[PDB]
Design a protein around this nucleic acid. Structure first.
Ligand SMILES: [Ca+2]
Ligand SMILES: [Ca+2]
Ligand SMILES: [Ca+2]
Length: 289
DNA sequence: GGGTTTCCACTTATTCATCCTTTTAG
DNA sequence: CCTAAAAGGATGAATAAGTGGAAACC
């Protein structure tokens, strides 16, 4: 079952990653051997996504990552041409576009067989230093000798894939002063590191609702785009993901979510039996699925 | 066959997703 | 008084990113 190209690119902005290995290999003619690719690592439950992606691109290999994870690794050099073609027609918009750029650059040096010369390896070290977490220091100990991205969401099918990765569909039960002492608050969320604060704010306007609650943890910091007004969730957010279908386990979470939303539309969230069903759906979704 | 590629097992730091309470708006 | 909306506290882990080893090619 193939994945829509834009949805895939959305799920890549969220879950994907590029890799450029520059390993010390004594059996190599320049002392170093390289490996270039693109990978996604999900929980074992979303293995069906990696397989669907594999059927869509016709490339990559799947192996386990520990007991609870599985990966899709596309390293076969000729298969890297599929990655580039796709991402050229359906580009990324996260700061990962800066990583994809460096990916193409490393691709060129190897397509010219330049990674087999002392300069090519030196050129790859230059490419890797600004890629993801940069060189491993020791590579700088052996080779001592940014540019932010700011695009906007291209369309909803992208948000679908991205929300399929970073998204959260929360039924928030609040201890309130109402008759039942429990207020039902549906919450839609998208979490992202503060490196893309622009894009996150872009969500407010692009969807016509929501806000950003600053998030932080000791040394780290990120953002959380949330939507709490039921009218926006019932009228603006739910329809977006009804036409632009989600993928993975998070779809079932989204469906259960809407079930509660129908009950909130019918005012059954105020009755006792309603609060039972809602509390029922909640316990069976997300980490309780 | 000697240099290179591709693969499969495996590791880890944090950025996520997840759950919750309190406070404010209407 | 009642319900909805927004703000914020807390954290384990599924991601992002990476590594060790060597069979598989060419
Ligand atoms: Ca991400
Ligand atoms: Ca995810
Ligand atoms: Ca998570």
């Amino acid at each position: 079952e193939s994945i829509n190209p834009w949805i895939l690119t959305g799920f890549a902005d969220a879950e994907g990653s590029f890799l450029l290995r520059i390993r010390n290999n004594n059996k190599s003619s320049v002392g170093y051997s390289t490996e270039l690719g693109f990978q996604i690592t999900l929980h074992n439950k979303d293995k069906s996504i990696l397989e669907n992606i594999q059927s869509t691109w016709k490339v990559g290999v799947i192996a386990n990552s520990g007991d609870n994870a599985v990966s899709l690794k596309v390293t076969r050099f000729e298969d890297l041409k599929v990655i580039i073609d796709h991402f050229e027609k359906y580009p990324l918009i996260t700061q990962k576009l800066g990583d994809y750029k460096l990916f193409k650059q490393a691709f060129s040096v190897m397509e010219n067989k330049e990674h087999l010369k002392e300069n090519g390896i030196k050129e790859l070290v230059r490419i890797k230093a600004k890629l993801n977490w940069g060189l491993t220091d020791e590579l700088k100990k052996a080779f001592p000798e940014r540019s932010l991205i700011n695009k906007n969401i291209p369309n909803f099918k992208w948000l679908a894939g991205f929300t399929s990765g970073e998204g959260h569909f929360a039924v928030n039960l609040i201890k309130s002063k109402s008759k039942l002492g429990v207020q039902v608050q549906l919450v839609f969320g998208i979490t992202q590191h503060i490196k893309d604060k622009n894009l996150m704010n872009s969500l407010i306007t692009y969807l016509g609702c929501g806000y950003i609650i600053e998030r932080n943890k000791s040394e780290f910091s990120w953002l959380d785009f949330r939507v709490t007004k039921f009218s926006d969730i019932n009228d603006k957010i739910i329809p977006v993901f009804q036409e632009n279908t989600l993928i993975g386990v998070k779809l079932e979470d989204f469906e259960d979510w809407c079930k509660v939303a129908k009950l909130i539309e019918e005012k059954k969230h105020l009755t006792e039996s309603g609060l039972d069903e809602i509390k029922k759906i909640k316990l069976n979704m997300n980490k309780g699925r």
